[PDB]
Amino acid sequence: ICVWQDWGAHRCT
Amino acid sequence: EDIIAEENIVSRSEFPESWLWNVEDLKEPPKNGISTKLMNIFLKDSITTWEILAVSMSDKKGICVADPFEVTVMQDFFIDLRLPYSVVRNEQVEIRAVLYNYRQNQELKVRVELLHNPAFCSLATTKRRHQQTVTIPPKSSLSVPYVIVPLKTGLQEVEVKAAVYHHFISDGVRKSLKVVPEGI
Amino acid sequence: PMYSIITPNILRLESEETMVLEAHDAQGDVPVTVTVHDFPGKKLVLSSEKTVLTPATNHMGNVTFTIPANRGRNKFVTVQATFGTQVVEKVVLVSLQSGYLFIQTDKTIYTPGSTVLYRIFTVNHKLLPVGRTVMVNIENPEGIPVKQDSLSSQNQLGVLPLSWDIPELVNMGQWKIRAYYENSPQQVFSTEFEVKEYVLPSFEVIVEPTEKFYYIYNEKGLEVTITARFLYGKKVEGTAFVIFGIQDGEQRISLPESLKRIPIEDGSGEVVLSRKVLLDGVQRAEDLVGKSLYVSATVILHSGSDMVQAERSGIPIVTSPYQIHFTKTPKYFKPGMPFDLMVFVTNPDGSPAYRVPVAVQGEDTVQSLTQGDGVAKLSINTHPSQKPLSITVRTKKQELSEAEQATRTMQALPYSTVGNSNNYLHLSVLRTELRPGETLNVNFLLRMDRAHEAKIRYYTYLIMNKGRLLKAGRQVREPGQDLVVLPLSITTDFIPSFRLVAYYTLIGASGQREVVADSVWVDVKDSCVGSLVVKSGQSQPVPGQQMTLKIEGDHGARVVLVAVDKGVFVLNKKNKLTQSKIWDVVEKADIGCTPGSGKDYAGVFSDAGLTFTSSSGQQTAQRAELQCPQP
Amino acid sequence: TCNKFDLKVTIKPAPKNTMILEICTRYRGDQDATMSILDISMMTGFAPDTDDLKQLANGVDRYISKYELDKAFSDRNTLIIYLDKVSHSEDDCLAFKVHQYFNVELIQPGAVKVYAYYNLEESCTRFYHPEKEDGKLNKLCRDELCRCAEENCFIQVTLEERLDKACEPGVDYVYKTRLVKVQLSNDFDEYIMAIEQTIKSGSDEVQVGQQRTFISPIKCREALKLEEKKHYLMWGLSSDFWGEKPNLSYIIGKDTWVEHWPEEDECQDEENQKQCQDLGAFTESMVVFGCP
Ligand SMILES: *[C@@H]1O[C@H](CO)[C@@H](O[C@@H]2O[C@H](CO)[C@@H](O)[C@H](O)[C@H]2NC(C)=O)[C@H](O)[C@H]1NC(C)=O
Ligand SMILES: [Br-]
Ligand SMILES: [Br-]
Ligand SMILES: [Br-]
Ligand SMILES: [Br-]
Ligand SMILES: [Br-]
Ligand SMILES: [Br-]
Ligand SMILES: [Br-]
Ligand SMILES: [Br-]
Ligand SMILES: [Br-]
Ligand SMILES: [Br-]
Ligand SMILES: [Br-]
Ligand SMILES: [Br-]
Ligand SMILES: [K+]
Ligand SMILES: [K+]
Structure with a gap:
């Protein structure tokens, strides 16, 4: 459900 | 006597294991891109299910193998003649003619007959018929055995005809077995 | 530049x-x-x-x-x-x-003194007709050429009909037709036929286990039903002789104590292989897992005039009714990003198990049901660590017990970046039954840092099908967008399967150009590109009766036919041409x-x-x- | 050929025409055969006793299906007996009565076949008949060629009919004979005749007082009822011979006339007067007129 990063609509947590 | 004469009975003889080895082009103007070819075939004499396999080849669409298509060919009264694959010349063998009655109510009084073939020795002669009368109940079968000695090599033919007393019901079958030489 | x-x-x-x-x-x-x-x-x-x-x-x-x-x-x-x-x-x-060369014979099995009728279908990599010269051999069980042709299919619409007369004196066994294109003699296409002395049987015997496997702990043993019916449809009355055995690759072990004589009443009979007889026959119980059982039935009509022998082999001995396969799942992952598993679940015979819950272990209770073709999509998130990811997927089929449920583990390695940069691409689709004439959404998922993300203004994608580039384009992207969706139209050109391989490029940190790529494999539902249907007009016919055959297909198509007595398949049903055998060859x-x-x-x-x-x-x-x- | 099973089949009259069929079988291998089949066909118009089959059926290690057992006596031209095993050390025997529910002249030999369930190709068939050696159809074989002897035994009396019959080119010889010795065997009976008058001489240029053998199937023995020392009128065909004249024979077939010629003393009785003056007149007319 998510990508580990600090931008974008699908950040983790 | 009120029974069909042996000579008024054409035996079934066309029993190929495969046939309809045919090629056809779908020329007919298409309805929905699909063209429908009609084909007038005559079914062979075997009492089975035939499986029909069509394969098409197209310049634009390529290769298509269809699902197989089955046709069952059936009769209510018939003979099944169980010949072996081959027999050795001058050996006495027993073959069976199985008579089927798939009628629901009628029990059948039938006259069965092995026809004379000078290629075989049997109780059928040129001037004497080898015939048996039998009564088959509905929905059942009866084995009628025949003892023959193949006197001549090659592809040879065995023929049996049956008919029911008082009714226009009959069947005949003629098939082949290979007769092979003895040796030492 | x-x-x-x-x-x-x-x-x-x-x-x-x-x-x-x-x-x-x-x-x-x-x-x-x-x-x-x-x-x-x-x-x-x-x-x-x-x-x-x-x-x-x-x-x-x-x-x-x-x-x-x-x-x-x-x-x-x-x-x-x-x-x-x-x-x-x-x-x-x-x-x-x-x-490709596909070869069709009229029958599965022949006697000495008969004719083998056959055709070769000459098609290109797109399964379309080509005219090339083809070399075709018929060989005996020993492998000696017995008939040798070299012909051209030019102007023949991709069909080569040939025939061969089997001599009266001939070695019985498994004969072969081998065929190659003249230009490519390394790549030989073969089919097989049997030569035997026989007469046609008048009935068929079906041998059917109640489950398509044997569970080693099952006290009931292996239950089998024997059905017999005449080729014309009616039910058989007789007696069956039934014997079981074990198979451990090439080797067969007959279990003589399993031999049973049962009545075939109303076309049907029932027979059991007991668990004790099975185990006493191998002089432990788990050691049989991986092996298989066969069952041999011989049916004699009450007349005694006809007898048919049949076999059902390949009944796997198992500790689970399912198998999990990771063969449709990428073996590399992008750290930080989702990892998709196309789990493929089969029944122990190799046929795809439908409607079966699968779940990943750990992030456990997520759950997903397999589709018609027995695949399920499961997605796990990964942490940004360059570390071998181990994954365990298990069956969660209820009615099964914990021990009965299947289990399989795989390892995926990290996709290594150009210069320890952490720039990744990840492609994703849904796993549903994809037919031509449908739209499929391809998700592009980007992973890089906020400082470098704005550089990427597009992805190039590539469609590979049947060994060639089918379609290529660009998927545009604006800064800040995690996901961009591509609506890809699926046509008959995409049929068997296809690969989608996408990349982006940039000049990253310290002067060096970089290419970042991902790929996904996608199944497409098997059919013909066109259509072909054989049916009768109306509808039993009598022998010698005329009837109408109706053939529905593509316009301008050449159609080639056979009719085979079903008595032939009772003796041998191997090697028959089917559309999906064709596709499997395309996939290989x-x-x-x-x-x-x-x-x-x-x-x-x-x-x-x-x-x-x-x-x-x-x-x-x-x-x-x-x-x-x-x- | 039976190299996997020994099979012995005898049919004897019970000691309305009722006989007893006996089948004895031996497996010709190392151990016993497991489940095996006896496929039995009946002689024309014969059916086994239902209670006899029920005795064999209720014997340990035999099986006869109930489908078979509650059959209407007369619809049983074939049956299977299932054997759970066949002994390799001694002959495993069975016996049952068979009744002639249908009386027909000329009855076809029955047959018995034995084989193990797993190998039908390796099987044994023996035939049986109340009057035939080894239940075999009569044939005459010379090396590899054979001719069927299941032909009719002899032709079917008044004057005129004989003279019309005997004067065909197809009728090479016409003899008055004396039966000198009857040589009975298991298949072909031999009747040694002395030729007393060659009423018509054909390709066998035999002189008067010389002997020629007449060969006839064992089935014809009762119908012919030839006796030693009795006299016969006999005509037949030129194709009915057997041997090139040192080991020569005549075949009594469908185209062979055999008739009792009453001796001088018997002709004086008032039953043979009609026949003897017809036979006396036949010979005169055949000698004198010939066959123009
Ligand atoms: C290479 O370019 C050609 C033409 O430039 C492409 O053909 C186009 O593709 C569509 C299908 O998506 C066709 O229907 C059109 O005729 C073409 N477009 C137009 C209007 O020019 C071809 O698809 C390209 N090859 C690949 C592999 O993508
Ligand atoms: Br035909
Ligand atoms: Br036709
Ligand atoms: Br063409
Ligand atoms: Br060969
Ligand atoms: Br089966
Ligand atoms: Br970031
Ligand atoms: Br490819
Ligand atoms: Br399409
Ligand atoms: Br850039
Ligand atoms: Br398909
Ligand atoms: Br129509
Ligand atoms: Br005994
Ligand atoms: K597919
Ligand atoms: K018993």
């Missing part, structure tokens, strides 16, 4: 292939000339074909070229693309493979070798069956192998 070139891993002669040419970070019209050369020297093969990449269409286009047959082992070509003054050359493998020929992704960017392109070669040095390694690696 980076110029790239993309072609298949393996090229083909006298077949049209596409070269996708791209100018990255360039202005104005860029003239491109593409020439194909022989490798060890310069001779120039075909060449030509001219394009101009325009800024209007975004500096992306293609050339369509056809390599002619010029004249041991591997044949290569050096392929050059001149972007202005800049030369980008790539050595690429070449296949002599002309296409795929030049792409993995379910998707790769070791790195080059590893991605290569495994999907593509070369990549840029003007600024980044490239796929050379492929000098015509077949995929062995695992």
